[PDB]
Amino acid sequence: DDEFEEFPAHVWEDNWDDDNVEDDFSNQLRAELEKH
Amino acid sequence: IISTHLAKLYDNLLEQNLIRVIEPFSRVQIEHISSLIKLSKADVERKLSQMILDKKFHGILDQGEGVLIIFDEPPVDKTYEAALETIQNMSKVVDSLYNKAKKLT
Amino acid sequence: LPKNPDLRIAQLRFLLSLPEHRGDAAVRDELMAAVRDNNMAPYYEALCKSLDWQIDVDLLNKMKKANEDELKRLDEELEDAEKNLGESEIRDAMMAKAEYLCRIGDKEGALTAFRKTYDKTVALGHRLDIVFYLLRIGLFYMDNDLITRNTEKAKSLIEEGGDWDRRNRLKVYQGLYCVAIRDFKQAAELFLDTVSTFTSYELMDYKTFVTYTVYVSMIALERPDLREKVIKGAEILEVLHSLPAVRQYLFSLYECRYSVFFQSLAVVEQEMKKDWLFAPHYRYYVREMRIHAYSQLLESYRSLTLGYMAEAFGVGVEFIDQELSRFIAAGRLHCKIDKVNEIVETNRPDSKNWQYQETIKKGDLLLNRVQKLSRVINM
Amino acid sequence: TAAAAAEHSQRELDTVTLEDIKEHVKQLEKAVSGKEPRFVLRALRMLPSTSRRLNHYVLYKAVQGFFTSNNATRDFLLPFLELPEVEAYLQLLVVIFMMNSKRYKEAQKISDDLMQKISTQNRRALDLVAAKCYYYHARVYEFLDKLDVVRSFLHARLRTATLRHDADGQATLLNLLLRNYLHYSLYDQAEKLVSKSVFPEQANNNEWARYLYYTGRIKAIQLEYSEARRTMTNALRKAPQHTAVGFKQTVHKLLIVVELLLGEIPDRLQFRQPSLKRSLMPYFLLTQAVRTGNLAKFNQVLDQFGEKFQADGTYTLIIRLRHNVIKTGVRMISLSYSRISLADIAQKLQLDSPEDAEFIVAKAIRDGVIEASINHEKGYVQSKEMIDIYSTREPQLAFHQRISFCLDIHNMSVKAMRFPP
Amino acid sequence: YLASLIRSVVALHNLINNKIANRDAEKKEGQ
């Protein structure tokens, strides 16, 4: 088919939230219960 | 061997009594139901939540004013179902038409 | 089948190759013991190079000399077999040579020897055994390309002809690979299909297999199927009787005792992050289980208050609000917060509403395809 | 002599390519002789492949052996190589090979010869070849780096090709003219021309994609974000799949920017795409920074990747970014809440004051990105009382648009149904 | 809407068949 030579040129399905950096849920829960 | 069966019987009887006492209503106070059934508010609330989640009767709780909105859910419209599977069939037919045309022309 | 290679070695190596865990020295003792027993010079060298460890030159040289002696003996036996013995014993000698190369850990040498052995051999059973060796090596080295190539090969061999046992073992290998590549749905399917007849003891122990099946099944199965095929699963219950934590975790989720469920989820995250196969999936698994618990609790409510959510989940209202906001924003929950008078309304779409939205989406896809077809062809 | 064997194989390939050129030429004769002023499109469909496979000796032998009907115009081809449509198509191949050789001066001389010839011959079945020549001449002047007289000349050619009710030529001229205006940053004039012109509703898919891309660029820089985004998504859909990597990359970049401006988040699948991962990685960093809402990360990524930002062109849009970074923050705050208070909004968005948060939510109302009310008597932003949208005319309108589209597809198909006898 | 979608798909299939038949006929006539 026609081509646009005019314009110069994991194995999963990742998700946006995955890259977010946060503490491990175990540590989060430990903190929550310590302050609760 | 006896405790497990008796507990299961207790749960079944509680379910049946809840159904019987909740049938003559459309919006009740969990407090009123608990008073009718002679149990505790927390236990009746948890049992009702489990029943609703398992789809034993058509109702949704509300832990605010303390209500159990029971009703009848309209049957799922089968027309949209059949339409969706027909849409899938036509999508794969369009795939076949691609395989024909884009490769023979 | 034999543990050649033994995936316990990969387990220990990966566990060592992690922060805040290097130097425990129990992993070091066990790994060094196994390496010395199996005389793995290439693997020892690779580990030391990658992880910057000291080298005990004395034992390294001793076991290298032993390895060279064994390799020369195997080559001499193969030469004798070729000179005098027939193709059957030539294939047997090649099989033994590949076994020994895998035992010492010669990745590329073992691969080449196995390729030659497979090309020469014609027996269906021996071909299955060779491809299973290839798959086990592929899992050992976490090479997705080789793993999938050999998986396709083994499936083709089974289709051409195979028996019940090798079919089950292929099922288990497929489940392991799916767990590796985050196909938890297919992993649950395969593990639950093959749980009653687990035989691949070379990959793990039955208890580890059952724990993997429980985790995967719970993350991949709805409430009805979970109850039918796990809570009411004979073998799963039998093994969970010996495993007192996984039983707690699964039954907490099922019976909706959510505080215990969150505690169990924390411990399971820690165990699964320590694990080697699930290692690049613990964050995703915990996120999915948090969403699962929130959805299960909100499935039977229309207006749930953050106070009650915090009480049920054994957490604070601030934490519940944060998590609910994040998940609602990501679109993984049907519920709207109301902070002035702390409440969570449940805006679940009616059956007809959801059917209409699904029709709109599917029709948009199909209509885009149809437009592409029409505009491409009419010109 | 491996060189001799390779030369003989190359000459066999040359014979095959000459036979292909003969096939295309005879298709041109069939088209002109018969009705259906087409099949020139069939001949051109292999034009990219033929141009790629062209060779110096191939073209030299072609010019030597052809153009025998009349005229001595081969004197303009033989020294540099050392009919109504056939001359145009062979000559177009010649100029394409000259461009491949990169000799822009005689490339433009020969192109001007083409252009005079086509202007002289006022035929109707030559319009497609004329459009291809126009595109390649715009390209040769781009390579020469002039792109100055192209504006005026292609403008006149567009006037002629719209006075004549042509579609392919109109689309090609409009695309090239808009490209010139953009390359020279004449966005105002481009907007005026697109507003006062009409794109041929039935035009080649590639030209449609180009026109949507350019129009989306105009709208984005013109403060029409919704229109820019929808047009750009449509352009991406129209674009080819297994080619046009550069065009797809540019469309993806600008679409990602315009989405971020609208206040949404691009799909991670775009970035995950192997053909676009490395190219779009800077925009992946930008998307991560905006989603995190971290001004420090935004600034450091901007400083790091300013180079690509002139390479493509987004600075005004990239500060409008910061604007819509705070806009996206407020949009999500209103999306995952129903009755949040102004103090809570300020706390969650790190805004200095509740009054500032109030101004920001009012501007969110401007942009329509929260579709929510507010009450300052008690100080909280109520949301629109969500309605079960099936007992209303929205489903009727959606189904009406889709039904009309389906009827139009059926009509166009049953009209394109053709019988050659 | 579902009815119209099916009708359009059928029409496109018919047009594809017609294009294939026309090209086959012209090719055979030429050769």
PDB file of N, CA, C and O in Angstrom, chain B residues 10 14 17-19 21-22 25 28-48 61 65-68:
ATOM      1  N   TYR B  10     -28.816 -23.594  61.546  1.00  0.00           N
ATOM      2  CA  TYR B  10     -29.074 -22.276  62.110  1.00  0.00           C
ATOM      3  C   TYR B  10     -29.056 -21.213  61.024  1.00  0.00           C
ATOM      4  O   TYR B  10     -29.939 -20.352  60.963  1.00  0.00           O
ATOM      5  N   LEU B  14     -32.212 -18.963  59.854  1.00  0.00           N
ATOM      6  CA  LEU B  14     -32.121 -17.509  59.888  1.00  0.00           C
ATOM      7  C   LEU B  14     -32.457 -16.916  58.528  1.00  0.00           C
ATOM      8  O   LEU B  14     -33.175 -15.914  58.437  1.00  0.00           O
ATOM      9  N   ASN B  17     -36.293 -17.226  58.034  1.00  0.00           N
ATOM     10  CA  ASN B  17     -37.012 -16.269  58.866  1.00  0.00           C
ATOM     11  C   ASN B  17     -36.848 -14.850  58.339  1.00  0.00           C
ATOM     12  O   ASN B  17     -37.803 -14.066  58.344  1.00  0.00           O
ATOM     13  N   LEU B  18     -35.640 -14.496  57.893  1.00  0.00           N
ATOM     14  CA  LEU B  18     -35.435 -13.170  57.322  1.00  0.00           C
ATOM     15  C   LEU B  18     -36.302 -12.972  56.090  1.00  0.00           C
ATOM     16  O   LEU B  18     -36.923 -11.918  55.922  1.00  0.00           O
ATOM     17  N   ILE B  19     -36.368 -13.980  55.219  1.00  0.00           N
ATOM     18  CA  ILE B  19     -37.212 -13.865  54.032  1.00  0.00           C
ATOM     19  C   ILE B  19     -38.669 -13.675  54.440  1.00  0.00           C
ATOM     20  O   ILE B  19     -39.374 -12.804  53.913  1.00  0.00           O
ATOM     21  N   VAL B  21     -40.001 -12.516  57.252  1.00  0.00           N
ATOM     22  CA  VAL B  21     -40.293 -11.250  57.912  1.00  0.00           C
ATOM     23  C   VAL B  21     -40.050 -10.052  57.005  1.00  0.00           C
ATOM     24  O   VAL B  21     -40.593  -8.972  57.267  1.00  0.00           O
ATOM     25  N   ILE B  22     -39.253 -10.205  55.947  1.00  0.00           N
ATOM     26  CA  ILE B  22     -38.972  -9.082  55.062  1.00  0.00           C
ATOM     27  C   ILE B  22     -39.898  -9.046  53.853  1.00  0.00           C
ATOM     28  O   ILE B  22     -39.993  -8.003  53.191  1.00  0.00           O
ATOM     29  N   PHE B  25     -42.835  -5.997  53.022  1.00  0.00           N
ATOM     30  CA  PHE B  25     -42.214  -4.683  53.110  1.00  0.00           C
ATOM     31  C   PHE B  25     -41.628  -4.304  51.758  1.00  0.00           C
ATOM     32  O   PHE B  25     -41.502  -5.132  50.853  1.00  0.00           O
ATOM     33  N   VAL B  28     -37.385  -1.157  54.983  1.00  0.00           N
ATOM     34  CA  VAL B  28     -37.470  -1.446  56.406  1.00  0.00           C
ATOM     35  C   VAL B  28     -36.228  -0.914  57.098  1.00  0.00           C
ATOM     36  O   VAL B  28     -35.198  -0.656  56.474  1.00  0.00           O
ATOM     37  N   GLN B  29     -36.343  -0.750  58.409  1.00  0.00           N
ATOM     38  CA  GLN B  29     -35.210  -0.387  59.247  1.00  0.00           C
ATOM     39  C   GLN B  29     -34.576  -1.664  59.785  1.00  0.00           C
ATOM     40  O   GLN B  29     -35.267  -2.512  60.364  1.00  0.00           O
ATOM     41  N   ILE B  30     -33.265  -1.807  59.575  1.00  0.00           N
ATOM     42  CA  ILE B  30     -32.563  -2.975  60.098  1.00  0.00           C
ATOM     43  C   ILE B  30     -32.848  -3.137  61.579  1.00  0.00           C
ATOM     44  O   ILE B  30     -32.913  -4.260  62.088  1.00  0.00           O
ATOM     45  N   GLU B  31     -33.034  -2.027  62.295  1.00  0.00           N
ATOM     46  CA  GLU B  31     -33.416  -2.116  63.699  1.00  0.00           C
ATOM     47  C   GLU B  31     -34.761  -2.813  63.856  1.00  0.00           C
ATOM     48  O   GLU B  31     -34.925  -3.676  64.727  1.00  0.00           O
ATOM     49  N   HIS B  32     -35.738  -2.451  63.023  1.00  0.00           N
ATOM     50  CA  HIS B  32     -37.049  -3.086  63.102  1.00  0.00           C
ATOM     51  C   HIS B  32     -36.957  -4.573  62.790  1.00  0.00           C
ATOM     52  O   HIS B  32     -37.568  -5.402  63.476  1.00  0.00           O
ATOM     53  N   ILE B  33     -36.194  -4.931  61.756  1.00  0.00           N
ATOM     54  CA  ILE B  33     -36.046  -6.342  61.407  1.00  0.00           C
ATOM     55  C   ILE B  33     -35.371  -7.101  62.542  1.00  0.00           C
ATOM     56  O   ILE B  33     -35.771  -8.220  62.883  1.00  0.00           O
ATOM     57  N   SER B  34     -34.330  -6.511  63.135  1.00  0.00           N
ATOM     58  CA  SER B  34     -33.642  -7.154  64.247  1.00  0.00           C
ATOM     59  C   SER B  34     -34.580  -7.358  65.426  1.00  0.00           C
ATOM     60  O   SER B  34     -34.553  -8.406  66.077  1.00  0.00           O
ATOM     61  N   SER B  35     -35.410  -6.358  65.727  1.00  0.00           N
ATOM     62  CA  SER B  35     -36.377  -6.511  66.808  1.00  0.00           C
ATOM     63  C   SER B  35     -37.366  -7.628  66.498  1.00  0.00           C
ATOM     64  O   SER B  35     -37.726  -8.412  67.384  1.00  0.00           O
ATOM     65  N   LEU B  36     -37.820  -7.712  65.246  1.00  0.00           N
ATOM     66  CA  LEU B  36     -38.751  -8.773  64.872  1.00  0.00           C
ATOM     67  C   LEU B  36     -38.117 -10.150  65.023  1.00  0.00           C
ATOM     68  O   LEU B  36     -38.764 -11.090  65.498  1.00  0.00           O
ATOM     69  N   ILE B  37     -36.850 -10.290  64.624  1.00  0.00           N
ATOM     70  CA  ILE B  37     -36.222 -11.608  64.552  1.00  0.00           C
ATOM     71  C   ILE B  37     -35.477 -11.993  65.825  1.00  0.00           C
ATOM     72  O   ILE B  37     -35.037 -13.146  65.947  1.00  0.00           O
ATOM     73  N   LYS B  38     -35.332 -11.076  66.782  1.00  0.00           N
ATOM     74  CA  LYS B  38     -34.722 -11.372  68.080  1.00  0.00           C
ATOM     75  C   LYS B  38     -33.226 -11.662  67.956  1.00  0.00           C
ATOM     76  O   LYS B  38     -32.702 -12.565  68.609  1.00  0.00           O
ATOM     77  N   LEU B  39     -32.530 -10.884  67.126  1.00  0.00           N
ATOM     78  CA  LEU B  39     -31.080 -10.985  66.996  1.00  0.00           C
ATOM     79  C   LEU B  39     -30.421  -9.629  67.218  1.00  0.00           C
ATOM     80  O   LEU B  39     -31.083  -8.672  67.636  1.00  0.00           O
ATOM     81  N   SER B  40     -29.123  -9.539  66.949  1.00  0.00           N
ATOM     82  CA  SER B  40     -28.371  -8.306  67.116  1.00  0.00           C
ATOM     83  C   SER B  40     -28.227  -7.591  65.778  1.00  0.00           C
ATOM     84  O   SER B  40     -28.197  -8.218  64.714  1.00  0.00           O
ATOM     85  N   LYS B  41     -28.132  -6.261  65.848  1.00  0.00           N
ATOM     86  CA  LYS B  41     -28.105  -5.453  64.635  1.00  0.00           C
ATOM     87  C   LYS B  41     -26.910  -5.808  63.762  1.00  0.00           C
ATOM     88  O   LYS B  41     -27.041  -5.962  62.544  1.00  0.00           O
ATOM     89  N   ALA B  42     -25.728  -5.940  64.367  1.00  0.00           N
ATOM     90  CA  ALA B  42     -24.533  -6.236  63.583  1.00  0.00           C
ATOM     91  C   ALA B  42     -24.644  -7.590  62.896  1.00  0.00           C
ATOM     92  O   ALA B  42     -24.312  -7.723  61.710  1.00  0.00           O
ATOM     93  N   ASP B  43     -25.105  -8.609  63.622  1.00  0.00           N
ATOM     94  CA  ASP B  43     -25.213  -9.940  63.034  1.00  0.00           C
ATOM     95  C   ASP B  43     -26.231  -9.961  61.904  1.00  0.00           C
ATOM     96  O   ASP B  43     -25.981 -10.544  60.841  1.00  0.00           O
ATOM     97  N   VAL B  44     -27.393  -9.337  62.111  1.00  0.00           N
ATOM     98  CA  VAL B  44     -28.397  -9.334  61.053  1.00  0.00           C
ATOM     99  C   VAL B  44     -27.888  -8.556  59.850  1.00  0.00           C
ATOM    100  O   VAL B  44     -28.141  -8.935  58.702  1.00  0.00           O
ATOM    101  N   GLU B  45     -27.155  -7.466  60.083  1.00  0.00           N
ATOM    102  CA  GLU B  45     -26.604  -6.695  58.974  1.00  0.00           C
ATOM    103  C   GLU B  45     -25.606  -7.520  58.176  1.00  0.00           C
ATOM    104  O   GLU B  45     -25.629  -7.518  56.940  1.00  0.00           O
ATOM    105  N   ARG B  46     -24.712  -8.232  58.866  1.00  0.00           N
ATOM    106  CA  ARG B  46     -23.731  -9.050  58.160  1.00  0.00           C
ATOM    107  C   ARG B  46     -24.405 -10.170  57.380  1.00  0.00           C
ATOM    108  O   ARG B  46     -24.040 -10.444  56.230  1.00  0.00           O
ATOM    109  N   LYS B  47     -25.394 -10.831  57.986  1.00  0.00           N
ATOM    110  CA  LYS B  47     -26.099 -11.893  57.276  1.00  0.00           C
ATOM    111  C   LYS B  47     -26.830 -11.344  56.059  1.00  0.00           C
ATOM    112  O   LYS B  47     -26.835 -11.968  54.994  1.00  0.00           O
ATOM    113  N   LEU B  48     -27.464 -10.179  56.199  1.00  0.00           N
ATOM    114  CA  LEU B  48     -28.154  -9.578  55.068  1.00  0.00           C
ATOM    115  C   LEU B  48     -27.175  -9.222  53.962  1.00  0.00           C
ATOM    116  O   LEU B  48     -27.468  -9.415  52.776  1.00  0.00           O
ATOM    117  N   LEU B  61     -28.724  -2.872  50.806  1.00  0.00           N
ATOM    118  CA  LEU B  61     -28.700  -2.297  52.138  1.00  0.00           C
ATOM    119  C   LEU B  61     -28.282  -0.830  52.086  1.00  0.00           C
ATOM    120  O   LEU B  61     -27.896  -0.295  51.044  1.00  0.00           O
ATOM    121  N   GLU B  65     -29.110   5.694  57.334  1.00  0.00           N
ATOM    122  CA  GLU B  65     -30.387   5.690  58.039  1.00  0.00           C
ATOM    123  C   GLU B  65     -30.746   4.286  58.521  1.00  0.00           C
ATOM    124  O   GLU B  65     -31.691   4.120  59.299  1.00  0.00           O
ATOM    125  N   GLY B  66     -30.009   3.273  58.069  1.00  0.00           N
ATOM    126  CA  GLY B  66     -30.224   1.916  58.532  1.00  0.00           C
ATOM    127  C   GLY B  66     -31.405   1.280  57.837  1.00  0.00           C
ATOM    128  O   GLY B  66     -32.406   0.948  58.477  1.00  0.00           O
ATOM    129  N   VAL B  67     -31.295   1.101  56.522  1.00  0.00           N
ATOM    130  CA  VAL B  67     -32.422   0.718  55.688  1.00  0.00           C
ATOM    131  C   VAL B  67     -32.031  -0.481  54.835  1.00  0.00           C
ATOM    132  O   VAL B  67     -30.853  -0.743  54.590  1.00  0.00           O
ATOM    133  N   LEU B  68     -33.047  -1.222  54.393  1.00  0.00           N
ATOM    134  CA  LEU B  68     -32.885  -2.356  53.483  1.00  0.00           C
ATOM    135  C   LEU B  68     -33.885  -2.163  52.347  1.00  0.00           C
ATOM    136  O   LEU B  68     -35.038  -2.590  52.448  1.00  0.00           O
TER     137      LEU B  68
END
